[PDB]
Design a protein around this ligand. Sequence first.
Ligand code: FES
Ligand code: FES
Lengths: 61, 61
Amino acid sequence: VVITARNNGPYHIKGSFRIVTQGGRELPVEQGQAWLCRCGHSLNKPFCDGSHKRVEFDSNL
Amino acid sequence: VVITARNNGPYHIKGSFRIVTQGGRELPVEQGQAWLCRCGHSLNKPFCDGSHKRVEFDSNL
Ligand code: FES
Ligand code: FES
């Protein structure tokens, strides 16, 4: 599994992994890839929905 | 690999994985486990530094 934190962007996850809530609810992994919100403002958490551009999330690693 | 998105807090990643920048730089993973900032406010991105509590991050999944 490789996690790429995109600059000014989401975490890109690729490989064989599961996403779960603290409660234990399985969230959907499609095609062994996901983009998870890193900016805090997605309206579809934990998935990135483009909100990072709206709030000009500034994080360059 | 299991990614647990903690309520009002970081992503917990457990298992065999790497973390890389979009630039290609490997980031240091301690003992098959990391907490990655979900709130957008860590001053040590991509790692959670407890800033989620300071800015009262609200995401209960
Ligand atoms: S990183 Fe894309 S919506 Fe937050
Ligand atoms: S989730 Fe803990 S610092 Fe952002």
